[PDB]
Paper text:
Here we present a series of TIGR03971 SDR crystal structures from several mycobacterial species which contain an insertion in the primary sequence at the NAD cofactor binding site. These crystal structures demonstrate that the inserted protein residues almost completely cover the NAD cofactor, only leaving part of the nicotinamide ring exposed to solvent. NMR experiments did not show exchange of the NAD cofactor, whereas binding was demonstrated for a number of small molecules which could be potential substrates, products, inhibitors, or artificial redox partners. Experimental results are consistent with the notion that the SDR family enzymes linked by comparative genomics studies to mycofactocin do indeed keep their NAD tightly bound beneath a protein structure that may interact with a specialized adaptor machinery for redox exchange.
With the exception of the M. thermoresistibile target which did not contain NAD, all other mycobacterial SDR target crystal structures contained NAD, which appears to have co-purified with the protein after expression in E. coli. For each of these crystal structures, the adenosine mononucleotide portion of the cofactor binding site is enveloped by the inserted residues and only a portion of the nicotinamide ring appears open to solvent (see representative examples in Fig. 2A and B). In addition to the insertion loop which covers the adenosine portion of the cofactor, a second loop which typically contains two α-helices covers much of nicotinamide mononucleotide portion of the cofactor. In contrast, this loop is ordered in each of the mycobacterial SDR crystal structures presented here. The combination of the insertion loop which covers the adenosine portion of the cofactor and the ordering of the second loop which covers the nicotinamide mononucleotide portion of the cofactor results in a significant decrease in the solvent accessible surface area of the cofactor in the mycobacterial SDRs, relative to other NAD- and NADP-dependent dehydrogenases. Only a small portion of the nicotinamide ring appears available to solvent in each of these cases, indicating that the NAD cofactor is tightly bound and potentially non-exchangeable. The structures presented here have a cofactor solvent accessible surface area of approximately 18 Å2, whereas other NAD- or NADP-bound dehydrogenases have a cofactor solvent accessible surface area of 82–89 Å2. Given the encapsulation of the NAD cofactor by the two loops in mycobacterial SDRs, a large conformational change would be required to release the NADH cofactor after a redox reaction had occurred. Alternatively, these structural elements may not allow for exchange of bound NAD/NADH with free NAD/NADH.
Numbering used by the authors:
A (entry chain A): 3 to 214, 222 to 278
B (entry chain B): 4 to 216, 222 to 278
C (entry chain C): 3 to 213, 221 to 278
D (entry chain D): 4 to 278
The structure:
Amino acid sequence: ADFEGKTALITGGARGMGRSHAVALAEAGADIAICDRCENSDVVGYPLATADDLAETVALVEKTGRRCISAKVDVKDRAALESFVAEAEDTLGGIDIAITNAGISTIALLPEVESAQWDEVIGTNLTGTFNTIAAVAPGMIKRNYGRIVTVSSMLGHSANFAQASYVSSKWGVIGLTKCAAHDLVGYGITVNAVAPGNIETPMTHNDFVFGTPTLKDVESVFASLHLQYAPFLKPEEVTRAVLFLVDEASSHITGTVLPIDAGATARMI
Amino acid sequence: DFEGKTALITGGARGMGRSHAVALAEAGADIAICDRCENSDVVGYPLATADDLAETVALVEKTGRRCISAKVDVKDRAALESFVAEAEDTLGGIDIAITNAGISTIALLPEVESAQWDEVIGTNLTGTFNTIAAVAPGMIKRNYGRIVTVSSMLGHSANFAQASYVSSKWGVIGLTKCAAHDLVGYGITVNAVAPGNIETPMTHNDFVFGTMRPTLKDVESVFASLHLQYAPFLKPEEVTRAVLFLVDEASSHITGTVLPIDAGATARMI
Amino acid sequence: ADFEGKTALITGGARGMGRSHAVALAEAGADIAICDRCENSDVVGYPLATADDLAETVALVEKTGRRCISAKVDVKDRAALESFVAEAEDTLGGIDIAITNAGISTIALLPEVESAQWDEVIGTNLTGTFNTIAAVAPGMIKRNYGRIVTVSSMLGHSANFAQASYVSSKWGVIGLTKCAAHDLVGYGITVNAVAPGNIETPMTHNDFVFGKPTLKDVESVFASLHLQYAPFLKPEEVTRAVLFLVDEASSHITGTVLPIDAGATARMI
Amino acid sequence: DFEGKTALITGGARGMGRSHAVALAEAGADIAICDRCENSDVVGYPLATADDLAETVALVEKTGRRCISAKVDVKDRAALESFVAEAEDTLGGIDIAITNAGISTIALLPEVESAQWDEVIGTNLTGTFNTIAAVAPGMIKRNYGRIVTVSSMLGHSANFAQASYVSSKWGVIGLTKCAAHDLVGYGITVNAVAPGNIETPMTHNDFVFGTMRPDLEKPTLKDVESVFASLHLQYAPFLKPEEVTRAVLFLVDEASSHITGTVLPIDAGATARMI
Ligand SMILES: NC(=O)c1ccc[n+]([C@@H]2O[C@H](COP(=O)([O-])OP(=O)(O)OC[C@H]3O[C@@H](n4cnc5c(N)ncnc54)[C@H](O)[C@@H]3O)[C@@H](O)[C@H]2O)c1
Ligand SMILES: NC(=O)c1ccc[n+]([C@@H]2O[C@H](COP(=O)([O-])OP(=O)(O)OC[C@H]3O[C@@H](n4cnc5c(N)ncnc54)[C@H](O)[C@@H]3O)[C@@H](O)[C@H]2O)c1
Ligand SMILES: NC(=O)c1ccc[n+]([C@@H]2O[C@H](COP(=O)([O-])OP(=O)(O)OC[C@H]3O[C@@H](n4cnc5c(N)ncnc54)[C@H](O)[C@@H]3O)[C@@H](O)[C@H]2O)c1
Ligand SMILES: NC(=O)c1ccc[n+]([C@@H]2O[C@H](COP(=O)([O-])OP(=O)(O)OC[C@H]3O[C@@H](n4cnc5c(N)ncnc54)[C@H](O)[C@@H]3O)[C@@H](O)[C@H]2O)c1
Ligand SMILES: [Ca+2]
Ligand SMILES: [Ca+2]
Ligand SMILES: [Ca+2]
Ligand SMILES: [Ca+2]
């Protein structure tokens, strides 16, 4: 079992990719700590995860036979993350693997992007990643082991219309990934990013995103973003890149960005 | 060259912001400059003073141009917005904007203090967003703008102890390219300059010299290593000329780009 | 922006961008050496320059007051270039500025790309650039001064369908640029690339490429490659970026790639 | 599980190509491997021999798999096509291709001999082109392929005295993105691995150690470690071929169907400094 006797922390673990990552790590043998904000944002048009979503991930992780701990945590809140990390380090015996998956997407054109919306997207997606790295690194340093995977986007090395907040945060995540990779280099820690294309999760599959109306009605616009026919990839397709990077054998892969985007990267760098 | 045009420069009190302002003034633009004019508790070197800002105003005026200034924190969107309105009432609509206000810090993860992260992200990235958001309505209305953001050599690389600064300068590029999309159909371009080591009070000060080793000569080797060519520091005017190239009316079809002025550091990378 | 006392070499100087660069450098005070193969190629579907084309550019340069030398030279022939450089040392005082502009475009899908076509595109566009830098470098080292501008493309940092040969050569040119920037760094020489988008020249404005098929018929297809709604830019828009780079005051800009691509670069790195 | 899959590996006589060949075999693939098996006039270290290639053949068949081999120069498209048809016939068609054949040289501009430029561009860039061209028709017919090209840390950076090598490796990445375009509709993916300093006979030889540490008449491994290690972020001057092999296996997996046109660095943090 590849990951037996490891422990993983996944932020935004209540649904979508975060649940996917937690469940696959659990199946391969890791104990799991998941957290999620479990509430809506006024500046986000689609519903975020709920308390029941989170319990369901816990139930799915436990079904594999692993230990799981969970908590309602806003990654913007550094003290809150640090407290939950302390619990996990003590309940599960140190955190080996951190996935900074918590994140939000918005659509709004410049100059009419609301400061509160900018704040939340930068805050959750970029500062929340910073807060998560900074929260797990001391334990990984003391243990001279870790694998941190950050989550950027296709949009983390490109750009589109009406995406200033989201794109700025996902570019900064890549910069952040490479710095953490420097600072933690000497302690047996790696830091890499996954950059997904369009993934079928409740971030993209909801009535607000459809509005800006069927799945069938929106597919062509999503498909234009990809080189390959596929309008949406499965969360599992990103999870297997995550698992490749957080393997112990990825000791000398650090500071990298791995795209899972159906050939969108074929168009660019 | 720039006669009849009006340019907004943030962090206009000294350093590269002063150089940009004066060069645009000599070329014929009227200038609107703003600066924080105060220190920050999480930045180890002194920031500009009001006297620095008043100096840039006199330099711009010594060219024959008109100049207005204001004490402004670019983290404050509403402050920027009122200063834009202030500027246009006096000098006409803003045609050119340089998002130059910025700060640098040195701190290793995971001992990066949250207030310092907030400050750096806030000034460098959120401040750039606030400046663009401040100027764009009038550029859209007038159907003309040239916006230059300021990233860094570190905006497309990374180094030790620079998480806040590097994350911000990466952010600036993605923002630049985004602003280049939303603004595209209104005759507005948005490009970044990415300077290497530049001789300004950001780099030339005791705090930076102390932390990198204390005199100029003792820190030259450290700064030289970052460049491919031998020159430890470049003149701010070397960045300014890149700015002027990009904000030229003739640059209507250059948008979403990153122009490095980094003494060959970009020869080692993308 | 004054080049009095300087001599500039422009390959593919017979028409299009080379001619644009040659005339503008001459206007700004530079003496000029221009060469072109002046001959069609069997693996390129549109016509290349004629000897009359080259004589026009000589005449256009001389009208500015400058001295000009010209020769029929295929840039794949290193010895021919070196011979033309030697004529430039003897007559014009040696080449201070070089623009490796000579190049060709082809269209063909893998796996049906003919080796003879791959060879000609890599030879002219990639090796031809190498041959030009190698030919002009020794004189620039001897005088401790040089400005070299190579010509890549929006496709030298992206990719598209049916363009393996072209795209590969233009990617290689960017690597070569950054290599030449290294080797020549100690000698007062800079090496930078321009990367144009769709430019109105005889490379794009011809029967073959348009393939009854008029300009107004192809405009929307060319426009889709740009972000701004301009299907083609003028050669002069590329030329002014070249002048910016080869200026004496650009001594500390080296190894860079300057896009002139109407916002294509806004979507990518 | 690559059981029932056939992999072509060029440069399979030693180094990373042998590493790829043995791992794919162990994982269930049958193997077609080819190599030049002859030194080059313009490369300063020895290349592989026919006995090297035979060694790889023997090691693969020890795993229980079928293996075919040929002396092939990747610069010769017709020779690659002949070898591919022989593979198609004996082993049922090539599902996976790793374009590993390549060489490195050292020479400062403008003193780069044309003949060295031509060989490096020819083997590294054109030979990758040739390999892609040769295997793609079978992959198209069967509507399945996984192609991995081999660029380098230097395919997205530059250094002194490597114009030939660096131009070739940049070219490879562009070519990779175009093949990904051209072949996308036929169930074929094309990705690059970009290795850092790898312990193979390309780097571990008397010619290479002589360069970097010449002021030093008889340079040993230990005398060169520090200069190689300054190219990496992490301590290790050299990585194992198997560390690249493992990325190769990730990419050529059937499950990697929606990863195409990407460049995967295995470079011990070098990519942490850059893009
Ligand atoms: N869905 C896509 O197509 C796609 C594409 C590229 C990148 N991504 C990225 O992948 C990541 C996961 O997204 P997903 O597709 O699973 O969407 P999702 O909305 O289903 O999952 C995101 C989870 O993060 C949680 N969250 C949001 N803000 C939080 C906060 N402040 N603190 C803690 N938790 C918070 C949400 O409650 C939710 O459960 C995000 O970073 C996103 O930007 C997604
Ligand atoms: N100097 C370098 O080597 C170098 C290298 C790369 C990028 N940069 C960037 O160039 C830009 C200019 O910096 P500089 O080198 O001229 O240094 P500087 O410190 O002399 O100038 C920066 C100016 O911005 C002002 N400022 C800081 N925070 C502000 C805020 N919140 N609101 C308004 N004004 C504020 C400062 O008071 C100062 O006058 C910055 O974005 C910096 O990151 C500098
Ligand atoms: N036109 C575009 O949209 C475009 C876009 C990006 C890059 N480019 C590049 O710009 C450069 C200039 O092209 P252009 O648009 O002026 O096209 P062009 O065909 O008008 O000019 C190229 C010139 O180079 C000459 N040439 C071709 N092969 C040669 C060889 N072996 N030796 C010497 N000369 C040779 C041709 O005769 C021609 O006169 C080329 O490198 C091209 O790849 C063009
Ligand atoms: N070793 C490193 O540090 C490193 C780093 C990055 C990339 N690479 C690349 O990895 C690939 C494999 O190199 P390696 O380190 O395994 O070195 P290697 O020299 O041990 O193996 C390369 C093999 O390719 C063969 N070869 C050379 N030219 C050929 C040709 N024209 N036709 C057929 N075969 C030919 C050689 O005979 C040799 O057996 C190369 O593309 C190299 O550029 C190596
Ligand atoms: Ca076990
Ligand atoms: Ca006038
Ligand atoms: Ca105006
Ligand atoms: Ca042997």
